[PDB]
Design a protein around this ligand. Structure first.
Ligand SMILES: CCCCOc1ccc(C[C@H](CC)C(=O)O)cc1CNC(=O)c1ccc(C(F)(F)F)cc1F
Ligand SMILES: CCCCOc1ccc(C[C@H](CC)C(=O)O)cc1CNC(=O)c1ccc(C(F)(F)F)cc1F
Ligand SMILES: CCCCCCCO[C@@H]1O[C@H](CO)[C@@H](O)[C@H](O)[C@H]1O
Ligand SMILES: CCCCCCCO[C@@H]1O[C@H](CO)[C@@H](O)[C@H](O)[C@H]1O
Lengths: 258, 258
């Protein structure tokens, strides 16, 4: 079957290249040399006034929080199209497709954020802006609480030096997850995941021949991402409890609803 | 535009439903199906003339075949809906909400296409099961069958064709007041376009018909009441026929209906 794994992997890579606005390849060329640097209120206003780029304005920390929601909505759209282009995802009934996306998108999002991140900050607005990690840390709690763990995960994840062909299989494995709550056809999803994981293992052997233990390291990263999302959801719950004037986008209300 | 909108819907209907009312009406008149009317003819139909959990008994076997046709028709309705203008632009969870609360209304309307007052076409029309036989089945399983014939006979008196039904079923699915809908304004907007298209189409297709468009709006309300009563019957069967299986997709559909 191993020669069908290579074609399986290539189909997933093509779904990735077709559907995601930013690749790690493009992002890393931007980050190595230019993006307008957002590092304080004045540069953020500059960036919004046209140099780089929503519910009614509230304050700076809430505004950034709203922009975080907008990127999640847009990435969910891309992840949905990516998943629909995956072998046998769209053969599942639509409710199973929604269940897999509901519980998988944030795990995928936080892994993909690593592609547009270095230790100093984050690419925004199609790579035309760069918002500094220090500026994001300087925001008001509880909003700054959600930021730093994602940088901490991303820097360690980027040390693995994956490329876009690796990430396409990695993201596919995150989505096709058999133990999501309320899944209808568990055996079918488990079977698809096993095929992706076998394809991923085969791909890493060819693409990273000298890398030690890369496949089990990635399996651990998938476990770390589930914990990262658990902690993130807890922080989102505190924001919902304590920041009642701050809006939550309807799509995110449905994702975080129990 | 409005003609083109209708034509897109009609083509999606022809592309996705194998049995049209045109094909069915040829068979039912004489332009032949093996008649299933008792245990022996059903056995002959299963043995090869015409065509699941382990056999329990006659009434449960027919009940299982009803579930199988629903599962298959839901697959077709999903693909039909995905080809509707701006349905696919809805977020996937709203698509599922519309299908969850819409498929049985559409199914019972489309059953009229393959039904006369004497029975029902089965297995691509190769078989014809009689209303008398279905009435003879054990309670509570017989309880679900007769109200569908009652609706279908009166619905067939309107003499719609496949071009009409394509818009009618699109209107059923794109329904703005389904529980838990996320983007109600967007759905209401598509629904209003379909209803205008339906009225515009009926003027051309049935110029001499009196009050046909409000007649069809009332049929949509009748279908919602028919499904409410059917769902209550199905929940009682699930309570009283504990050894009878319910397909997982039907389990997810009827979950929260009252
Ligand atoms: C590791 C990078 C920093 C952390 O970024 C995060 C953190 C959590 C989330 C998850 C969101 C939070 C509402 C969700 O729960 O869906 C998204 C981003 C993605 N954020 C953005 O895309 C973003 C976009 C614009 C701006 C800004 F400052 F330019 F406005 C700041 C941003 F963090
Ligand atoms: C107006 C036509 C008669 C009533 O048919 C009904 C009634 C309710 C339903 C809804 C189903 C019931 C399990 C659902 O809840 O999804 C489906 C059919 C559709 N039934 C079938 O497709 C069917 C198929 C095969 C056979 C038989 F007898 F040949 F086995 C009998 C059948 F009624
Ligand atoms: C195949 C399209 C028609 C499928 C209809 C079945 C929908 O079931 C619903 O699936 C949702 C997850 O997507 C769950 O959140 C709901 O609890 C459940 O009721
Ligand atoms: C676009 C794909 C991403 C969608 C993720 C959001 C899914 O939300 C869920 O949608 C279901 C209806 O389908 C509801 O039954 C659930 O209550 C709700 O939690």
């Amino acid at each position: 079957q191993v020669a069908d794994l290579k074609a399986f992997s290539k189909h997933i890579y093509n779904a990735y290249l077709k559907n995601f606005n930013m690749t790690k390849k493009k992002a890393r060329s931007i980050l190595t040399g230019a993006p307008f640097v957002i590092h304080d209120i004045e540069t953020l206003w500059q960036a919004e006034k046209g140099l780089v780029w929503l519910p009614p304005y509230k304050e700076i920390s809430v505004h950034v929080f709203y922009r975080c929601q907008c990127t999640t909505v847009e990435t969910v759209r891309e992840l949905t199209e990516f998943a629909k282009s995956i072998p046998s995802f769209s053969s599942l009934f639509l409710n199973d497709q929604v269940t897999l996306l509901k519980y998988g998108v944030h795990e995928a999002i936080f892994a993909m954020l690593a592609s547009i991140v270095n230790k100093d900050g984050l690419l925004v607005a199609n790579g035309s802006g760069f918002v500094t990690r220090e500026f994001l840390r300087s925001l008001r709690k509880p909003f700054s609480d959600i930021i730093e763990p994602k940088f901490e995960f991303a820097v360690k994840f980027n040390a693995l030096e994956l490329d876009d062909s690796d990430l396409a299989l990695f993201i596919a494995a995150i989505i096709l997850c058999g133990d999501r709550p309320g899944l209808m056809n568990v055996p079918r999803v488990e079977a698809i995941q096993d095929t992706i994981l076998r394809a991923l293992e085969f791909h890493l052997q060819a693409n990273h021949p000298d890398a030690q233990y890369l496949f089990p390291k990635l399996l651990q990263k998938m476990a770390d991402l589930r914990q990262l999302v658990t902690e993130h959801a807890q922080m989102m719950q505190r924001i919902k409890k304590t920041e009642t004037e701050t809006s939550l986008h309807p799509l995110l209300q449905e994702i975080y609803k129990d």
